[PDB]
């Protein structure tokens, strides 16, 4: 074989240092894959690394997608054409600050123990691998492609110690034809290294850390020595920045310090910068952190304070690493990096608007049942879900309670907003005065704000979204529900010919003309909460709590000539004009460091 893991990495019989950067194909529009990969090569780096997101490729059971934004094969080809090698990390679980850590939400309805040696789960992964891996085998280095090696699971030592599970994934990958070296990655301390690895089965071990390479590599070396392994040192995720969460301040890391930290890694071994270019969590694909029982959703932008910013442009950090490489690793040739230009556009007028309630039938097919159903139970993975029932008021004032609902609920009676409850607020008493006679329409709009992507809440009860127990009026649970799943993947079905009323979730259309499409940012600082679309593509979520108050619009999302932005707003904000800016708008929050 051309690439071997011995006492060192060897490529064609010569010692080889891997200089990799992470770029997730699914977080960068395909039109910009070349741009981002070029900038990685230009830095003097020789390898690109990416996760593969199961929940993108098998969004519904048995339905596979490998084209367009998800054309991993094309991404790898672009990398190969640029003379870059590839590391692929096709774990069913990728963590990755990504919805449910990459697991398809439909697994939550199955009789199985997710992320374990449970055969039912392993078999689902197998059926997925049957579609994914044969696309990658021809792209192994030994088959004329560029893939050096692939990862088994992902940071499993930060979740469990089921060795049968790791063995099963390794076995599946091998059976599917993956004949390149395999490896695991984990935190470089004893507990995670012991739990996450198959070192005693000679499966290569790499470490994830964000600083102190000498110390962290020493801990890995001790672990290798203890098991008598003579292996090269590699940091598979060198965390070069920080991700962001709603309501929390943006923290950045000094470019020079980071470049120095990277130098230390390279002085002893190999690296994969996480992230090289972070990009965007388009649509509803953001992940979520947890603290005890509390969920902390992560933001749309995956800028990450990476070497390339969300847009793909070199930052001061890129330049600092470039200078470090030029000095300490001059044997790796560099190129001038590529920049994209951005544009701005003022005073784009509102053209049409419609209340969600007035365009429901166009957007969603209602599911009726006696008892309320959860989101995944209804066959929905992402987005919003409207629960509707009709009820007689049995007293002047009555109490309503949403029992076991997540993540955020807005309650309306006869179209009138009554209450909004987020997370732990859900379940608190709600009081109202309904119709004197006949039935009042009770509407509850629920949002899935992102399933936790790691750790102890990974399989928490709250991971299943929507209303899990029921809605109480007085002391009894209400029955006869119409459910309107609102994945909002069908903006073309928004019927702007219908009515609009203030103080309801609504869609707002803004039309503008573009001569030459360029990168830009939609300013949502004056709106409340919701999502935005440009030319039918879901840009992701906005929320005026910040820290991010914009949504990035890649040039490739725009068209020459007529364009339309649609804003779905849930909090009642109303603006007759929007603006696009050359740079993102930020909310400054106490404790930040820009």
The reply on whether position 529 binds its own copies by CB under 8 A is no
Q: Which of 97, 99, 153, 155 is catalytic?
A: 155
The reply on whether position 210 binds its own copies by CB under 8 A is no
User: Is 310 one of the annotated active-site residues of the chain?
Assistant: no
**Cβ atoms within 10 A of the Cβ of 61, count?**
14
What is the spatial distance between Cα 242 and Cα 253, in angstroms, rounded to a whole number? 8
Smallest distance, Å, CB 544 to its own copies? 29
Instruction: Kindly tell me which residue out of 171, 293, 490, 497 binds its own copies, with binding defined by CB under 8 A.
Output: 293
Closest to its own copies by CB, 479 or 589: 479
SS3 468: strand
User: Is 571 one of the annotated active-site residues of the chain?
Assistant: no
Phi-psi region of 256 (alpha: psi -120 to 50; beta: other; left: phi over 0): alpha
The reply on whether position 249 binds its own copies by CB under 8 A is no
Residue 2 · residue 254 · CB < 8 Å: no
The reply on whether position 290 binds its own copies by CB under 8 A is no
Smallest distance, Å, CB 78 to its own copies? 36
The reply on whether position 478 binds its own copies by CB under 8 A is yes
- Bridge-based pairing of strands 234-239 and 270-277 is parallel
The reply on whether position 167 binds its own copies by CB under 8 A is no
Q: Which helix (H) or strand (E) holds 513?
A: strand 506-514
Closest to its own copies by CB, 65 or 441: 441
Q: Which residues contact 294 (CB under 8 A, 6 or more apart)?
A: 423, 424
Cα-trace Rg, the chain? 25
Instruction: Kindly tell me which residue out of 479, 562, 589, 594 binds its own copies, with binding defined by CB under 8 A.
Output: 479
Smallest distance, Å, CB 316 to its own copies? 33
What's the distance, CA 551 to chain centroid?
A: 15
Instruction: Kindly tell me which residue out of 132, 195, 360, 446 binds its own copies, with binding defined by CB under 8 A.
Output: 195
Closest to its own copies by CB, 12 or 397: 397
Nearest CA to 73 out of 20, 169, 138 is that of: 138
SS3 77: helix
The reply on whether position 157 binds its own copies by CB under 8 A is yes
Smallest distance, Å, CB 161 to its own copies? 5
The reply on whether position 477 binds its own copies by CB under 8 A is yes
Residue 389 · residue 112 · CB < 8 Å: no
What is the spatial distance between Cα 302 and Cα 142, in angstroms, rounded to a whole number? 34
Smallest distance, Å, CB 376 to its own copies? 16
The reply on whether position 116 binds its own copies by CB under 8 A is yes
The reply on whether position 364 binds its own copies by CB under 8 A is no
What CA–CA distances, in Å, run from 364 to 107, 489, 490? 23, 11, 9
Closest to its own copies by CB, 191 or 335: 191
Closest to its own copies by CB, 330 or 392: 392
Interaction residues for its own copies, span 425-464 (CB under 8 A): 427, 455-456, 459-461
Q: Which residues contact 57 (CB under 8 A, 6 or more apart)?
A: 64, 65, 66, 70, 128, 131, 132
**Residues making contact with its own copies (CB under 8 A):** 113, 116-117, 157-162, 164, 187, 189-192, 194-196, 292-293, 370-371, 392, 394-395, 398, 401, 403-404, 427, 455-456, 459-461, 469-470, 472-479
User: Any idea which residues carry the catalytic annotation?
Assistant: 155, 237
């Amino acid at each position: 074989t051309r690439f071997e893991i011995r006492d060192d990495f060897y490529l064609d019989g010569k010692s080889f240092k891997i200089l990799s950067g992470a770029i997730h194909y699914f977080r960068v529009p395909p039109e910009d894959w070349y741009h981002s990969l070029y900038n990685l090569k230009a830095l003097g780096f020789n390898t690109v690394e990416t996760y593969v997101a199961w929940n993108l490729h098998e969004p519904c059971e048995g339905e596979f997608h490998f084209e367009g934004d998800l054309d991993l094969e094309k991404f790898l080809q672009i990398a190969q054409d640029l003379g870059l090698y590839a590391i692929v990390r096709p774990s069913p679980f990728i963590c990755a600050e990504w919805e449910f850590g990459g697991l398809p939400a439909w697994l939550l309805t199955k009789n199985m123990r997710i992320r374990s040696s449970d055969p039912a789960y392993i078999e689902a992964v197998g059926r997925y691998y049957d579609q994914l891996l044969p696309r990658l085998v021809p792209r192994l280095l030994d088959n004329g492609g560029n893939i050096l090696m692939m990862q088994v699971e992902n940071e499993y030592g930060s979740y469990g110690e089921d060795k049968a599970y790791l063995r099963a994934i390794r076995q599946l990958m091998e059976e599917c034809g993956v004949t390149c070296p395999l490896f695991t990655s984990d935190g470089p301390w004893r507990a995670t290294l012991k739990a996450g690895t198959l070192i005693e089965e000679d499966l290569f071990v790499t470490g994830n850390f964000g600083s102190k390479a000498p110390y962290n590599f020493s801990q890995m070396q001790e672990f290798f020595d203890e098991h008598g392994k003579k292996w090269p040192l590699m940091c598979m995720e060198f965390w070069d920045g920080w991700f962001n969460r709603w309501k929390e301040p943006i923290i950045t890391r000094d470019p020079k310090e980071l470049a120095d930290a990277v130098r230390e890694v390279l002085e002893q071994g190999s690296i994969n910068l996480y992230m090289f270019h972070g990009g965007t969590n388009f649509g509803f694909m953001n992940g979520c952190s947890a603290r005890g029982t509390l969920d902390l959703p992560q933001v749309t932008s995956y800028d990450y304070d990476a070497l390339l910013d969300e847009e793909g442009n070199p930052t001061a950090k890129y330049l600092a690493v470039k200078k470090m490489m030029a000095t300490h690793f001059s044997e790796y040739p560099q190129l001038e990096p590529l920049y994209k230009e951005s544009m701005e556009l003022d005073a784009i007028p509102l053209v049409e608007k419609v209340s969600l309630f007035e365009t429901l039938d166009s957007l969603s097919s209602p599911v009726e049942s006696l008892y309320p159903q959860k989101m995944e139970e209804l066959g929905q993975s992402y987005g919003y879900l409207l629960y509707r029932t009709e009820t007689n008021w049995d007293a002047e004032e009555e109490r309503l309670r949403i029992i076991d609902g997540r993540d955020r609920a807005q309650l309306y009676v006869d179209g009138q907003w009554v209450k909004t409850q987020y997370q732990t607020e859900i379940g608190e008493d709600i009081f109202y005065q309904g119709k004197k006679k006949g039935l009042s329409r009770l509407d509850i709009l629920i949002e899935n704000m992102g399933r936790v992507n790691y750790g102890h809440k990974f399989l928490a009860d709250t991971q299943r979204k929507g209303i899990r127990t029921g809605v109480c009026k007085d002391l009894h649970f209400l029955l006869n529900w119409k459910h309107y799943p609102l994945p909002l993947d069908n903006p073309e079905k928004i019927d702007f010919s219908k009515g609009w009323t203030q103080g309801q979730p609504a869609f707002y259309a803004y039309d503008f003309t573009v001569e030459e499409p360029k990168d830009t940012y939609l300013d949502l600082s004056e709106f409340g909460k919701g999502v935005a679309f440009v030319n039918g593509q879901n840009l992701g979520r906005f929320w005026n709590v910040g820290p991010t108050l914009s949504l990035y619009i890649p040039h490739s999302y725009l068209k020459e000539g007529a364009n339309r932005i649609i804003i779905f707003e849930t909090e009642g904000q109303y603006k007759e004009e929007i603006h696009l800016t050359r740079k993102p708008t930020l909310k400054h929050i106490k404790g930040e460091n820009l």
